[PDB]
Amino acid sequence: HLTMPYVMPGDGEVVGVGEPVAIRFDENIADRGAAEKAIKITTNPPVEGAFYWLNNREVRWRPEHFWKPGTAVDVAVNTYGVDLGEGMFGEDNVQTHFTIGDEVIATADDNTKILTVRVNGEVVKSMPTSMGKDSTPTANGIYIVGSRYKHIIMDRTDVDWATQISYSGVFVHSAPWSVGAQGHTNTSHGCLNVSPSNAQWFYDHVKRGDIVEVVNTVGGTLPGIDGLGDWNIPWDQWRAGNAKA
Ligand SMILES: [Ca+2]
Numbered sequence: 001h002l003t004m005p006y007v008m009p010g011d012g013e014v015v016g017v018g019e020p021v022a023i024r025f026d027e028n029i030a031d032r033g034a035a036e037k038a039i040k041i042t043t044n045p046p047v048e049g050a051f052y053w054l055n056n057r058e059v060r061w062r063p064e065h066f067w068k069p070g071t072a073v074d075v076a077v078n079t080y081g082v083d084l085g086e087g088m089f090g091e092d093n094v095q096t097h098f099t100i101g102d103e104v105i106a107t108a109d110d111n112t113k114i115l116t117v118r119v120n121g122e123v124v125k126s127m128p129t130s131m132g133k134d135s136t137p138t139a140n141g142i143y144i145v146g147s148r149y150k151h152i153i154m155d156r157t158d159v160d161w162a163t164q165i166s167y168s169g170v171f172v173h174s175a176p177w178s179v180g181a182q183g184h185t186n187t188s189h190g191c192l193n194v195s196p197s198n199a200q201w202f203y204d205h206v207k208r209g210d211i212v213e214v215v216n217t218v219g220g221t222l223p224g225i226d227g228l229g230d231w232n233i234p235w236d237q238w239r240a241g242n243a244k245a
Helices: 032-037 196-205 235-240
Strands: 005-009 023-027 038-044 049-053 059-062 070-079 094-100 104-109 116-118 123-126 141-144 148-154 157-164 169-173 192-196 210-215
Touching: 005 157, 023 070, 032 038, 032 059, 032 070, 038 049, 038 059, 104 196, 116 196, 123 196, 157 196, 169 196, 192 196
Parallel strands: 104 210, 169 192
Antiparallel strands: 005 023, 023 059, 038 070, 049 059, 070 094, 104 116, 116 123, 141 210, 148 157, 157 169
């Protein structure tokens, strides 16, 4: 009858301008309103933001637009002993403080099959890419950079320099097998294939909460409730929330 909250990002982290605050509970939350009320987010410079649930256990908070670099965020999850519905009570409080770093937005345009990395509005890197085949396309939309792996076995394929950008399993990563197609032809299951050198560059130069935007593919749009797809939910839907849904 107790539920523990877990907050991301980590205390003292510097994250990108797309990073939502995430409060994840280890049990389903029946009274989302109570949970939201128990979570106090302070921003400096102050910016309006709102809660939206990605699933029964995890709520996100973010502003209407990407964060401003330098913004400091304090999160107080004051859930200890709070009634969260159906006889479940918050086990404890948790807190985090984090800050926003540089604006890093990488745009993959299916028209050019180039991923262009912009840091604070400035092009710093361009890399040929091979995106999802027509039958398995990469969805368009805004993706948030999540975890990274120097090496990972995808699921069985060994992969180097893998930067995760969706929970659905889209990564930017080393793809030595499609170097010839990069910049020319889509060959993947959905991942953004780039050269070993470019994948290592990307891995080294991004951080959690940086943004990848995919445009002009034959896919649809990445689901807002993917896990890293938050920004695809239009603000008016996000702000309205789903506490009573
Ligand atoms: Ca109850």
